[PDB]
Structure formats: structure tokens, C-alpha cells
RNA sequence: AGCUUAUCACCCCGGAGGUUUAUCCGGGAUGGGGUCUUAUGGCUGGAAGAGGCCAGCACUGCUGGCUCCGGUGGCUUGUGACGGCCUGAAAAUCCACAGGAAGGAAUAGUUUUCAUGCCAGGUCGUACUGCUCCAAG
RNA sequence: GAUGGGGAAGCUCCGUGGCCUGAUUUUAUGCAGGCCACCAUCGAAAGGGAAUCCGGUUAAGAUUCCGGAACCUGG
RNA sequence: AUGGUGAAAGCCAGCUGGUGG
């Protein structure tokens, strides 16, 4: 054959530049990014930066040619184009003064659905359960986010309803096996089909919203996460035989509209699920019911809230410096004891966590030689030096695990 | 540098129109009604937008459904068809006449203002046929008029006609003066 | 070596610039937004 | 707080909270989740293998160095008193007359046990190299300085034994020049004149041939002369650079010419390039030849030392980089397999070698122990060293106008 | 393919003749000291196992040797370096130079104009005859 | 020689965009900015052009087949 | 007629003697 060019094959065709891919797709960067997020496409590091390009040392992001080529045939592009055409037509109608025509046009529109995207991105339910970690982590945070100009209140309400559905299913299924509390929030873990899915529930305080973060990307991710969560919830309810979607409890919604509402029905096999069995609890006002109520409900206990009006209870939770009544029939407990019980999975004695006492720390449940190294090769010598430098940090951590722990105790 | 051929042609057309001397019959447009009175006229007309295809279909379907299970007054709307408007004018039936200043065939509407003046029917010229079309659910109409205004708005229409008289017919009664377009 | 294969995420280059400069631009836009309201009182 | 973003193991400061209800809401939750979402699609995903091999397994299973004893361990005698730094050292074939030479022109000889001096004799004139005649019972010592080379026979031996070398010098009766009156009065035998300043010198195993190197002489950078005949020859006349050193093969009629980047083995009889070496280092400083010729060893200015296997390939079989400064002297022991290495950092090392040649196998080398004591002065450390003929004793010189002798 | 091999061209001292067949060079020469572009010269491997020159016997091949060492005295070719007369093509393709944005560290910091190793390299013309090719004394 | 065009009723004649950057582009998921200058194609088996040499093979083939040994483009 | 086809400069020695062609 004729003289082939210096670099026009191999990495030069397997990867396509971001700008080149966008130009070939004839799609705006916003729409391309949305499609990428929906498909989960990501940039890849070429084996040789200067070989993928034509000797260019300038920075670049290399995508997979096959992935982009396959993405070009997805219906989502057609739906996006239809949405753009509908938007232009609605703008024309609004500018023409025919509000009724605009209302009729808008009322007859239908949005796209990502159901087929899920069946190809996560062909099997275990994969969806594995990847639901990020979806839960985002939805739980968005549930407590107050409504703003960047996100309509309907989206926040839908996210909160999805989170409530998930929490109710978990409590009824009692699949929770490990819990933890952190500054960033309260971590919850459930053995959903043995996948030990973990999610972080942030504190219910008013979530500060820094305007720097671009909500457009966040909303795009949240849409896919909400669809995935809805499908997973439907699948789980069908597998368990419970009705779906469960009906909200209007009577309970008036009081606190907490986890108690949204009752579910059909149509104790583990130490975690058997703890607190048949127990009745009373939560003081100052303790977060939203956090403790879920744990007790999953454990199979009963909780009486102070707001029940806004005894027979064998356990009481209060964080006040001084308890007022101290009825002998109620066992006063700090939430740290409840957390420790779930972490260990056994009924640790309650006498160690009386109110007002010290709070114990809470931990998560999860030349002889130099002589022979003179002749080592450059690669081996560098590897050994880097390994020693890395192990220096491990040794420092091991030393510090006891140094301060012993020094502070003496004072 | 270079520019699109059509862009250059249209740009040169504006210069030619500005510099070329036009007869008194031409340039009678662009001496349009003031912004305020034109806005008031459009506001009044918006209350009488003719029924659109969707609304008419909905009304007919509702009537059919009512009949299936088992005396409205005369409809009121603005008349905008050029042939229909011209047939209404010269019959002393139209009360207000609106004429667009940007009709592509100028000769198509040169006689309409003069015909209205001869017939004595009040008339006015407004900028843009697109504005007239927007209020009648059409791309363009080039003309607009009212024939049967509701009693509630009869006084408003009379006052608008009286104001338009002074605003346009009296201010531009000398539009027949020295040929326009005499700009260096 | 007995190494365990795994997926790795390379650090996003120029993230610090994309954060700081964008924050500064947003601050400037917010500051300039009130200017239009202040100056629209002379209509 | 002063560190830049994303270069931080933890994005929050842990704090002690007395109660759960007193825990404040997190002030960075939204930012962290937004960054995670961004990385989920903008972070370049790569497939990598995480190394889990312990560093201990990388240690080679070399023979224990102590089993290779004896070898030098610590100093036992020190020579000093020179006004200038001792640039070179020389030892007689019997390992008794340790000669010393310094850039100030002072020449001294010291005992190997008590260290007492036995004889003494004398910016652009310095002594560059001194080497005892490999042949025994001659007492001929060569001295290189400036553009001339001097042959000196000190009175350490006597008159008849020294008359033996005087007869060789007279047998001859760049060109040779008669000694000056001062040279004659200072027990200097004869002098030679070279085209340019000489910087290196080496004797032949037979005690008759020797070579000299004249830097800045592009064509005459290297010359060969004979004591008996006062000959003047050259193995090669041209090269792609200046020549740095030259040495004779212990038992073959070829001279090892060491250039800056290359070393060339030129046959003095066949006048052909037997082999050309391609050292892994960039520039070479000195070269020595194993007495059996099985291994070629050289030193490089860029802290490198070369172990050139003449049977395996042109490039060195193995290279060492532990030296902290330019390697200045590397020589093979006359009897033992040990070879020493010294550099300007004042560090000396000795390595045992499996010189076994009964089979087509590469020689195994192991380090023995580190040595120090030559404090670096003006960035210069160990200048030259020589091995004892029969025992693991090493003589070293440094820029501090001091020489040290190491013994087991 | 590795050594080896440089007319020309260029570098350091110098301070008032060198040189071609054919007049060319200098107040920076005569001279001394060096570098480089490898045109084709010698070595080896390829490579004597190839081919050729002989002897012997088989009765369808084999066995033994030689294939070496030179010289300069006319035709020829390729190239190099000089010197006479008015500017003698275009494109494809490789390399370098000014450049400093970009990227480079702790269980592999970045790269592989370095070395070795691996794979693939399509279609047509292709026999014969034949304006153009080689020419001993 | 088409091509941007122009005569001829007429077969017909004259005329000689692909690259890079961005957190996804603040009234809220409709795209922003920067680089350079022109006109395809055909037209050389004596021009430029990357690469193979020795021995043998026939009824016609080889620098293609074989025996031996290298060279050039690309990943 | 209609519609097509084909092609001696120079320089060396003492105007005299010389070299290059």
C-alpha cells in the first residue's frame, strides 16, 4: 500500500476528542453532557497522550469512540430535539398573544422516560442495587434542601416522598444491620440482597445553599437517580408482595407528617431485627425523632412522640441536663446507647449511658537490610523507596493511635 | 470584506428608498399613529380577537355533546380580510380601519387610505403588518377593522375614533405636500 | 506482585481555577445585578 | 486550612461534641455531593493494579557478606603532613613501599605498619600520577607533572639494586630529555617531554611499557613509550573527542583506551579495534582491568561505576549508583576477588565477586561494608587508592592532604 | 550491518607569500594544533555450505583437492572539488530551528526520536516479438 | 475542467470548514468564544517517490517459484 | 446547400617566446 501517515490509526481512532465528539454529534454541550450523565459515559486515559492526538501536548479529555458512536442512535436525542422545537413554538405562541393556544400546546405534551436506559446501564437488579449508593446519597440530601429558584418545590417534594418510601420499606423489611453517626450526618447501612448498601442521611437542620454549585448538573443527576429509585422501589415492593405505591396517611400527615405516615401492607430473623422486640419508647422533645424513630421502627419497637397531642413505655430517651420527673417505670436512655446497640447487634447494658454522664467514644462498625539493597535496579530501588515512604505514614498512624490516646488519659 | 448577496441587496434597497423621491400617494405610510394611541387601539382590538381554530373546534364539540344528550347572541369579532374589508368599506359599514405600512405589494393598499377618506370612514395607519396579524391568529393581515362593537365598549370605540381623528387625520392632513424621500 | 486490579479516578485538572474564577464571576454578577435596579429609577 | 482544595485526606475538622442534639448541621454537604457528582462523569476512569507486595520480598537472597571475610573494616594507619593534597598513591609489587604524591610537588614514602616516613623528595604545575614499576627488584618510580614525566629511583633500596634500574635507564642511550642539575642532585633519573600537559600514566605488567594521556592534544592525546628504547608510539591517532585514560591488558598485547563516552580496546600488535564498549554512564574518569581479563571495570564522573562483562555484551552487565559523588578510583585486588570503589564523597566500598569462570555463568557480586574518613575538601574526596598485593589491605588518599590505610 | 576511510567545508596560536591542468587566496597569509558531511576504498559476517577448474570410481551419484599472490602502461563509468555564458520547473513527503502554553511523585511521578521482541502490509502490469539501452582486439 | 455566473429558441457556448477551548451557557437545563485564509477533479509506465540480493528450477516463469540471507510503512 | 468526420579571452617567462582550447 501507499505510505500511511505517521499517526492516523491505533489510539488516533479508538478515542475521539471532546470537541471532535461534540462536533460529530451536532449537539450542544449541555445536551451532550446530559446524555453522557444518563449513559454514565466517562473520559478515559489513553495509553499514550501524544499518540492519541497528532503529537499535541496540550491538555485534552479522551472519550471512547465506540461509546460515543453507540450514543448517537439513542432516542433521547430525538426527544431533546422535540423538546427544543416545542419550546420555540411555545415562545412564538406567547409572543403572539395567544395564551389559550400556548395552554393547549403545553397540556398535550409528554416527557421522555429513562426506563430503557436503566435496563441497559444496569441489566441486572444486583447492579442497580450496587449503584444505588450514589442515588440514595443524592436523594437524601435533596430531600432536606429547601425550595429555591433553582429547583421547583415539586422536585423536592418528589425526592422527599421517594426517601420516605425507601425508609418505610427498610423499616418494614428490617434489613438494617449497621448504623453510624457523623458530623456530615447519620450513616445507615442495610443488607439489601447481601449488597450492604450504605447511605448518608444529613442532619435535618436548614441546609445552607452555596450558589457557586451549578444546580443544572445536580438536577440532571437527580432526575436519573429518582427514576432509578422509583424503579428499584417498585421491584422491591413487587418481590416482597407489598402494595405499591403505598397510600399516604392524611390523619398522621396533619400531626408531624413523619416516618409514621405512609403506611404500607402486604399484597426478626437477625439479631439487629430482633433487638428492642416488643419494647415501647418515649422520645423527648430535644432528641431528633426523625433519626431515632426509624431505628426503633426497623427494630420492631414502638415510639410515642412528645408531639402526639400537639406510662406504659418501658424506655425513655432524653438529652436534658437534668431530668424532671424520673419515673421509675421508664428507663432513661441516651441515643448513644441506642446507636451502640445497633452497632454491636446486642442489648448492651443501659446502665452505662444514664443521662448526664460522660459519653464514651463512638466508633464505626467497619544496616543488615540496607546492605543488600545497594545493587538494586533503578526501578526496583525507586519502588522500594516509595514503598518505605508510604509505609512511613502507616507507621505514624499506628503510633498516633496510641500516643495521644494514652497521653490525654493521664490528664 | 464581503457580505451575503441578499443582505447587501436589502441594505441597498433601504438606501435607495430613503434617497429616492416618492410621489405623494407613496410615503403616506410611515406617518403612522403615535405609539400611545396605537397601543390603546391594539388593547381595544385584543378584546375582540376572532375565535381560533382550537377554540372554535372546542365550542363545536361542546355543542355536539350537549345535543347528543338533549340561542347565543350575534358573535362579535374584528374583520381583517382585505377583500372583505374593502367590501365593507364603500358600504358605510366599517367604523375603524387599520392599514399596515409594510405591505410587500405597495400598490395593493395605496388606494385604501384614499378610498376611506372619500367614504369618510375613520382610518389609521399602524407600523407593522405582523402586529396586525398577531392579534387575528394569522401571520399577517395588512389590515384590520371593527364593525360591531359591544355596547359596553361603544363609548370607548367612539372616544378612540375621536382621538384618532385629531392624532392622524388632522396632523397628517398635509401628507399630500412636497414629495417625500428628499434626504441627502 | 499479587496486585489486585481495580478502577481508579484521575484527578480533575484545573479544578481549583474552575472553582475560584467561577465563584469570582458569580460574585461580580450578583454585585452588578443590583446596579440595574438602582439605575432603573430614572425612567 | 491553608492547603489547596482536593489535596486533603479529610475535608472537615473533627470536633468533640458532648451530645447528639448539640451536633450542628454540616456546612459542606452540598459542595461534597456536587463534587462527587462531577467526578462521577468528568473524572478520567482508568484500570490499575494495586501493588500489595511487601518491601521485604524485594530484598535479594544474596550470600551473607560476613561469610566472605576477610575484608577491610577500619583504618589502622594515617599519613599526613603534605602541604598540598595527595593526588595519587602507589604501592610496590611487594606491598611495602607506599609512595605518596601531592599537587605541591612533595613526594613521600611511609611504612605500612608504624606509618613513619622513610624518604622525602620534591596552579599550573602539579604531580598528576605516580606508579611503582610492576616488575620487582628494580625500584623504578615514575612521576607525571605538567608536560613532562620523571623517573625516580629513591634510595630506599640501595645502590646495586637501584643500579639495576639505572642500567635500564641508560639502555636507551614526544622525546626524552636529560635530567637537569637539580634533578640529578635530587635522585631523579631522566625526564620526558610531551606535546601537551600529561594527566594520566600507567605501567605495563612487564615493567617496560607504559602509556600517557595528554588532554587538549586532539591527535596526540595518547602516546606509548618504552624505557629501554625510549620509544614513542600511539595505538590510534584520531577520535571523536579527547582521550581521558589508557591502560594495558594484564596478559594480552592490547591497550584499553578510555575516552569520555567510550572505551576502545586497541591491539598494540595487530593495530585493530578488538572491541568497543558502550558504558551505561555518560562520562568515564578511570578504568582498570581484571588480572584474568574476564571482567572490565571503570568509573564515571556522574557517580556511576561500570562492570563491563567482555563476554556477555558491550554494555555493562550491572551498574551501581550508591555513590553520592563522582567516582575517582576503582581497582581490582591482585589476589583476592574483592574490588574497591571510591568517590569524591569520601566514601569507600568493597565488593566480593564470584570470579568463577569454569562455566558460562555470570559473576555474582555482593557488597561487604561501607568505609569513610576522607573528609571532603573543595568538593573533592578520595583521589586515588591501591590494593595490597596479597592481603585485604587498602591504601586511600584524599583532598585533605591525608592518606589512610585500612586493615581487617 | 559494525569498524575503518574526508577532497571540500569549518575551529585555536600567529602578525607580513601559498596555489590550480587552467590564476585563485591573504594585515588575516605561509606554518603549527584540530573538528566534521562517509561519496566509495580494506576487514570480517553474509561467504564458501554457493558457483566454477580438475582426478577417481559408480551405472545413477558420490569421494578427494584448486578456486592464490601481484602491477602498473590506453578505453570507460559514478562522484568530488574548481573554472568560462544568459537565473533552467511544479507538487507530494521526512527532518530541524525561534517558541515555552501544556503535563510530570510516594505499594510503579511522565515518556519510550534508546535497545530487544510481535503482527499485517491490498489491486493491476508480469509469457513472446519488440521511438529507446552495452559495445574486444 | 466543473464550480460562483453570464449568452444561445436550441443540441449547447463563454467564464478558472475544519480545528481548539468551556465546571453545563445565573432570572434557571434553546450554545458561547478564538485560528487561518482558497476552489474539486483529470492530466508523467523517460519527472519526484519507502524498501531485496546470491545459487538452482522449465516444454514456456521468475529480482514473482524454490534454497539462502536483508530491507521499508503502520500498531 | 444541409448534418457530421478527419490533419581567440585568459595567464607564465625575456613587443618576442609559452599554457587553456
mmCIF file with all atom_site columns, N, CA, C and O in Angstrom, chain A residues 175-190:
data_model
loop_
_atom_site.group_PDB
_atom_site.id
_atom_site.type_symbol
_atom_site.label_atom_id
_atom_site.label_alt_id
_atom_site.label_comp_id
_atom_site.label_asym_id
_atom_site.label_entity_id
_atom_site.label_seq_id
_atom_site.pdbx_PDB_ins_code
_atom_site.Cartn_x
_atom_site.Cartn_y
_atom_site.Cartn_z
_atom_site.occupancy
_atom_site.B_iso_or_equiv
_atom_site.pdbx_formal_charge
_atom_site.auth_seq_id
_atom_site.auth_comp_id
_atom_site.auth_asym_id
_atom_site.auth_atom_id
_atom_site.pdbx_PDB_model_num
ATOM 1  N N  . UNK A 1 175 ? -34.185 -4.748 57.244 1.00 0.00 ? 175 UNK A N  1
ATOM 2  C CA . UNK A 1 175 ? -32.916 -5.187 56.680 1.00 0.00 ? 175 UNK A CA 1
ATOM 3  C C  . UNK A 1 175 ? -31.724 -4.395 57.204 1.00 0.00 ? 175 UNK A C  1
ATOM 4  O O  . UNK A 1 175 ? -30.584 -4.735 56.867 1.00 0.00 ? 175 UNK A O  1
ATOM 5  N N  . UNK A 1 176 ? -31.950 -3.353 58.008 1.00 0.00 ? 176 UNK A N  1
ATOM 6  C CA . UNK A 1 176 ? -30.837 -2.594 58.561 1.00 0.00 ? 176 UNK A CA 1
ATOM 7  C C  . UNK A 1 176 ? -29.985 -3.501 59.438 1.00 0.00 ? 176 UNK A C  1
ATOM 8  O O  . UNK A 1 176 ? -30.502 -4.283 60.247 1.00 0.00 ? 176 UNK A O  1
ATOM 9  N N  . UNK A 1 177 ? -28.666 -3.398 59.277 1.00 0.00 ? 177 UNK A N  1
ATOM 10 C CA . UNK A 1 177 ? -27.725 -4.187 60.063 1.00 0.00 ? 177 UNK A CA 1
ATOM 11 C C  . UNK A 1 177 ? -26.633 -3.366 60.729 1.00 0.00 ? 177 UNK A C  1
ATOM 12 O O  . UNK A 1 177 ? -26.071 -3.830 61.728 1.00 0.00 ? 177 UNK A O  1
ATOM 13 N N  . UNK A 1 178 ? -26.314 -2.177 60.225 1.00 0.00 ? 178 UNK A N  1
ATOM 14 C CA . UNK A 1 178 ? -25.283 -1.339 60.816 1.00 0.00 ? 178 UNK A CA 1
ATOM 15 C C  . UNK A 1 178 ? -25.686 0.120  60.668 1.00 0.00 ? 178 UNK A C  1
ATOM 16 O O  . UNK A 1 178 ? -26.270 0.518  59.656 1.00 0.00 ? 178 UNK A O  1
ATOM 17 N N  . UNK A 1 179 ? -25.368 0.914  61.692 1.00 0.00 ? 179 UNK A N  1
ATOM 18 C CA . UNK A 1 179 ? -25.663 2.341  61.702 1.00 0.00 ? 179 UNK A CA 1
ATOM 19 C C  . UNK A 1 179 ? -24.457 3.085  62.258 1.00 0.00 ? 179 UNK A C  1
ATOM 20 O O  . UNK A 1 179 ? -23.614 2.520  62.957 1.00 0.00 ? 179 UNK A O  1
ATOM 21 N N  . UNK A 1 180 ? -24.385 4.374  61.935 1.00 0.00 ? 180 UNK A N  1
ATOM 22 C CA . UNK A 1 180 ? -23.295 5.217  62.403 1.00 0.00 ? 180 UNK A CA 1
ATOM 23 C C  . UNK A 1 180 ? -23.742 6.669  62.342 1.00 0.00 ? 180 UNK A C  1
ATOM 24 O O  . UNK A 1 180 ? -24.636 7.031  61.570 1.00 0.00 ? 180 UNK A O  1
ATOM 25 N N  . UNK A 1 181 ? -23.105 7.497  63.167 1.00 0.00 ? 181 UNK A N  1
ATOM 26 C CA . UNK A 1 181 ? -23.404 8.921  63.255 1.00 0.00 ? 181 UNK A CA 1
ATOM 27 C C  . UNK A 1 181 ? -22.116 9.692  63.007 1.00 0.00 ? 181 UNK A C  1
ATOM 28 O O  . UNK A 1 181 ? -21.069 9.353  63.570 1.00 0.00 ? 181 UNK A O  1
ATOM 29 N N  . UNK A 1 182 ? -22.192 10.722 62.167 1.00 0.00 ? 182 UNK A N  1
ATOM 30 C CA . UNK A 1 182 ? -21.029 11.520 61.805 1.00 0.00 ? 182 UNK A CA 1
ATOM 31 C C  . UNK A 1 182 ? -21.419 12.991 61.773 1.00 0.00 ? 182 UNK A C  1
ATOM 32 O O  . UNK A 1 182 ? -22.596 13.349 61.864 1.00 0.00 ? 182 UNK A O  1
ATOM 33 N N  . UNK A 1 183 ? -20.405 13.850 61.644 1.00 0.00 ? 183 UNK A N  1
ATOM 34 C CA . UNK A 1 183 ? -20.658 15.283 61.522 1.00 0.00 ? 183 UNK A CA 1
ATOM 35 C C  . UNK A 1 183 ? -21.448 15.573 60.254 1.00 0.00 ? 183 UNK A C  1
ATOM 36 O O  . UNK A 1 183 ? -22.380 16.387 60.256 1.00 0.00 ? 183 UNK A O  1
ATOM 37 N N  . UNK A 1 184 ? -21.092 14.914 59.150 1.00 0.00 ? 184 UNK A N  1
ATOM 38 C CA . UNK A 1 184 ? -21.801 15.100 57.890 1.00 0.00 ? 184 UNK A CA 1
ATOM 39 C C  . UNK A 1 184 ? -23.231 14.580 57.938 1.00 0.00 ? 184 UNK A C  1
ATOM 40 O O  . UNK A 1 184 ? -24.015 14.894 57.036 1.00 0.00 ? 184 UNK A O  1
ATOM 41 N N  . UNK A 1 185 ? -23.586 13.806 58.952 1.00 0.00 ? 185 UNK A N  1
ATOM 42 C CA . UNK A 1 185 ? -24.918 13.260 59.077 1.00 0.00 ? 185 UNK A CA 1
ATOM 43 C C  . UNK A 1 185 ? -24.868 11.904 59.751 1.00 0.00 ? 185 UNK A C  1
ATOM 44 O O  . UNK A 1 185 ? -23.893 11.565 60.415 1.00 0.00 ? 185 UNK A O  1
ATOM 45 N N  . UNK A 1 186 ? -25.937 11.137 59.558 1.00 0.00 ? 186 UNK A N  1
ATOM 46 C CA . UNK A 1 186 ? -26.076 9.806  60.136 1.00 0.00 ? 186 UNK A CA 1
ATOM 47 C C  . UNK A 1 186 ? -26.003 8.795  59.000 1.00 0.00 ? 186 UNK A C  1
ATOM 48 O O  . UNK A 1 186 ? -26.801 8.852  58.057 1.00 0.00 ? 186 UNK A O  1
ATOM 49 N N  . UNK A 1 187 ? -25.048 7.874  59.091 1.00 0.00 ? 187 UNK A N  1
ATOM 50 C CA . UNK A 1 187 ? -24.867 6.843  58.078 1.00 0.00 ? 187 UNK A CA 1
ATOM 51 C C  . UNK A 1 187 ? -25.751 5.645  58.400 1.00 0.00 ? 187 UNK A C  1
ATOM 52 O O  . UNK A 1 187 ? -25.797 5.191  59.548 1.00 0.00 ? 187 UNK A O  1
ATOM 53 N N  . UNK A 1 188 ? -26.449 5.142  57.387 1.00 0.00 ? 188 UNK A N  1
ATOM 54 C CA . UNK A 1 188 ? -27.312 3.977  57.520 1.00 0.00 ? 188 UNK A CA 1
ATOM 55 C C  . UNK A 1 188 ? -26.881 2.912  56.524 1.00 0.00 ? 188 UNK A C  1
ATOM 56 O O  . UNK A 1 188 ? -26.573 3.218  55.368 1.00 0.00 ? 188 UNK A O  1
ATOM 57 N N  . UNK A 1 189 ? -26.860 1.661  56.977 1.00 0.00 ? 189 UNK A N  1
ATOM 58 C CA . UNK A 1 189 ? -26.469 0.532  56.146 1.00 0.00 ? 189 UNK A CA 1
ATOM 59 C C  . UNK A 1 189 ? -27.521 -0.561 56.246 1.00 0.00 ? 189 UNK A C  1
ATOM 60 O O  . UNK A 1 189 ? -28.008 -0.871 57.338 1.00 0.00 ? 189 UNK A O  1
ATOM 61 N N  . UNK A 1 190 ? -27.866 -1.142 55.099 1.00 0.00 ? 190 UNK A N  1
ATOM 62 C CA . UNK A 1 190 ? -28.835 -2.224 55.021 1.00 0.00 ? 190 UNK A CA 1
ATOM 63 C C  . UNK A 1 190 ? -28.295 -3.315 54.111 1.00 0.00 ? 190 UNK A C  1
ATOM 64 O O  . UNK A 1 190 ? -27.667 -3.028 53.088 1.00 0.00 ? 190 UNK A O  1
#
